[PDB]
Amino acid sequence: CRKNTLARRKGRHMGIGKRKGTANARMPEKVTWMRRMRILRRLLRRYRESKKIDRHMYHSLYLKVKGNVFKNKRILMEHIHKLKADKARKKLLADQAEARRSKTKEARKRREERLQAKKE
């Protein structure tokens, strides 16, 4: 029994011919979905509670994990890295444009102050 169990742990005696039941009987699709989605839904909690994802993209990726899109933890982590790298560019360009507009409005207000000092 121990030698046979060691062979099954190595992966032997598990061909196509020695399967006498269906795949749903051997490893259930519901149990596979439960394990898969529990891991893919608590990795987002470990990210959100610590540092990584914000409040708003958490719900979007939560619904996208509830849908059958993300296969496993590796490509889920890669998609989170892709959204983070896109969000960094989308906030960097917005901050540069906001800095340019803020300096322009400050220059316009200071020119208004100069004309106010020249009038009075």
Q: CA 100, CA 86: separation in Å to the nearest integer?
A: 21
Least distance from C-beta 87 to RNA, angstroms?
Answer: 11
CB of 112 to RNA, least distance (A): 31
Q: Are 62 and 44 in contact (CB under 8 A)?
A: yes
Which lies closer to RNA via its Cβ, residue 12 or residue 114? 12
Rounded Cα distance, 90 and 114, in Å? 36
DSSP assignment letter at 18 = T
User: Taking CB under 7 A as the criterion, which residues in 41-80 touch RNA?
Assistant: 41-43, 45, 48, 55-56, 58-60, 62-64, 66-69, 72-74
Residues 6+ apart with CB under 8 A from 54: 48
User: In the bound complex, what is the minimum distance in angstroms from residue 76's beta carbon to RNA?
Assistant: 8
Binding site for RNA (CB under 7 A): 1-2, 4-5, 7-31, 33-43, 45, 48, 55-56, 58-60, 62-64, 66-69, 72-74
